[PDB]
Amino acid sequence: MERKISRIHLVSEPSITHFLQVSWEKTLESGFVITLTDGHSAWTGTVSESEISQEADDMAMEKGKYVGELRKALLYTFNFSKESCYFFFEKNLKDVSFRLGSFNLEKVENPAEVIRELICYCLDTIAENQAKNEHLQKENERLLRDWNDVQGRFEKCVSAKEALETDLYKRFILVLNEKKTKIRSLHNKLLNA
């Protein structure tokens, strides 16, 4: 799963941060595979498409608002209750006050396994995104070099065209001034001779 560990705060220990592992199940409405760890216990809750469709409109409030709350929070002022294994927190915002989802999490006895999953996904994501960044520097450098080369090509084209136009105009001015001198000489000859 896309088990992204997102930092959350405890109810009694705000300074010590739990990492709400925001996973994926190919769907976003059904929440995520919510695995939680503290270094002393594990909370691996497998919430599925069973407390979403019915829990969306149970409190006389729209599914869209419920799904919006899930996206804005499950994916701030976070609070986790260890005693009940139930991820609920005070969402003290504008017109929002309720237990966000009936997320009765499941707890496995060994925190080492959820720590395994967290560390594995963390380092895999670091490696994947570092390779992504590497070929992105590669592509960015390639396009920067291409753009600079074409800009220099246009520089050379403009310079060459301006030089050719200038020298052609100068030669034409020489020829035309000589022709005009001939014309005025013919004017003088017709006037006198």
Binding site: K161, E162, A163, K170, V175, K179
Partner: protein, 151 residues
């Protein structure tokens, strides 16, 4: 030279005549704007597609902040206006001066405030113009007008 006084010269004659003349541009860019630009003026060639900025002097808008010539914008195609200006007899003055008369606004339009500072210090006031006046004009091989390309 090979130029005659009674036999009309064609392209082949002109190329041979011009080839006979040595190639040397010993003339300062102001003089192309004054006399050589008048060749396209007195004989009505100022409407040429690729060289029509001969007497139009624009602002090479390639700086994030105007009146400073060190903050060149990188990764953008703002230098095309200067080369298009350099494609003709346009005096490419990189800073706001009396020459600047066609401010070709590129990817940043918030710089108009800095243009207001020097829009009164110089006689021929420059006007806020879009990229169509320069960047797309020579791409279309023309010379757009300020009124139809304002902003």
């Amino acid at each position: 030279y090979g130029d005659s006084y009674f036999i009309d010269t064609d392209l082949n004659q002109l190329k041979e005549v011009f080839s006979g003349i040595k190639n040397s541009n010993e003339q300062t860019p102001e003089e192309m704007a004054s006399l050589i630009a008048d060749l396209e003026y007195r004989y009505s060639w100022d409407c040429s597609p690729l060289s029509m900025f001969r007497r139009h002097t624009v602002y090479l808008d390639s700086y994030a902040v105007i009146n400073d010539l060190s903050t060149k914008n990188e990764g953008t195609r703002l230098a095309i206006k200067a080369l298009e200006l350099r494609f003709h007899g346009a005096k490419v003055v990189s800073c706001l001066a009396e020459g600047v008369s066609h401010v070709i606004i590129g990817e940043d339009h918030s710089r108009v405030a800095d243009f207001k500072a020097f829009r009164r210090t110089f006689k021929r006031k420059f006007k806020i113009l879009k990229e169509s006046w320069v960047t797309d004009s020579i791409d279309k091989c023309e010379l757009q007008e300020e009124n139809q390309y304002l902003i």
